[PDB]
Write a protein that binds this ligand. Structure first.
Ligand code: RKS
Ligand code: RKS
Ligand code: FE
Ligand code: NA
Length: 174
């Protein structure tokens, strides 16, 4: 019913040193997308989408994804609660997602004003899913940065067809 490439040990997912949560606020474009449930589809290629991070009084993030689907904009909202160390988070109100028993976020690297790599891992219906997002402050990033993403995705066991670069669009995400 399902076959998944295993989640890597956390020992080989770096953590961004000295994480500045206020500086990580704002809109990010998903320019690179990889994971064990992520699969390249040339018939119907992945459209680019955007994720907005905004701190609250209590320093949790209100994370809002906006994506273009069925000729409309869909708004996926959830809370990231600070975890064991800075740059590391857990999901708030996990109770509202049936089957979901675990959720981890980890900021691998970022220069705040241009690019970022973030690692996600969830366990749901006892199935362990993980993904890496290549966040871009603009819709385009350099070749260097994208290969860096490609080769990092591979260091966690992902083949080429599990790595995608969503195609830039104008609807919803601007
Ligand atoms: O119901 C389901 O069985 C699972 C529940 C997702 C588990 C939580 N969870 O994954 C998060 C918070 O990230 N629902 C999805 O898989 C759909 C939800 C559409 C309704 N997810 C998304 O639409 C989605 C959009 C942007 C980024 C994401 O990571 C998404 O999962
Ligand atoms: C992550 O971005 C994505 O491309 C889409 C977002 C959906 C947007 C679609 N839509 O609503 C639109 C276009 O309007 N979703 C995933 O690929 C799922 C696959 C696992 C599904 C688990 N599952 O329920 C099954 C049946 O396989 N998610 C993850 O792989 C995943 C892994 C770790 C942490 C997460 O939070 C995840 O979501
Ligand atoms: Fe998700
Ligand atoms: Na270049």
């Amino acid at each position: 019913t399902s076959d998944l490439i295993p989640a890597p040990p956390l020992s080989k997912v770096p953590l961004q040193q000295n994480f500045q949560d206020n500086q990580f606020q704002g809109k990010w474009y998903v320019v690179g997308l990889a994971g064990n449930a992520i699969l390249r589809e040339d018939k119907d290629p992945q459209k680019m989408y955007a994720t907005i991070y905004e701190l609250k009084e209590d320093k949790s993030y209100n994370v809002t994804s906006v994506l273009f689907r069925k000729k409309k904009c869909d708004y996926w909202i959830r809370t990231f609660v600070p975890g064991s160390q800075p740059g590391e988070f857990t999901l708030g109100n996990i109770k509202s997602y049936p089957g979901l028993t675990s959720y981890l976020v980890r900021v691998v690297s970022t220069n705040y004003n241009q690019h970022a790599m973030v690692f996600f891992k969830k366990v749901s219906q006892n199935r362990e899913y993980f993904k890496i997002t290549l966040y871009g402050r603009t819709k385009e990033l350099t070749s260097e940065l994208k290969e860096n993403f490609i080769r990092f995705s591979k260091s966690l066991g992902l083949p080429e067809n599990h790595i995608v670069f969503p195609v830039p669009i104008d609807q919803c995400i601007d």
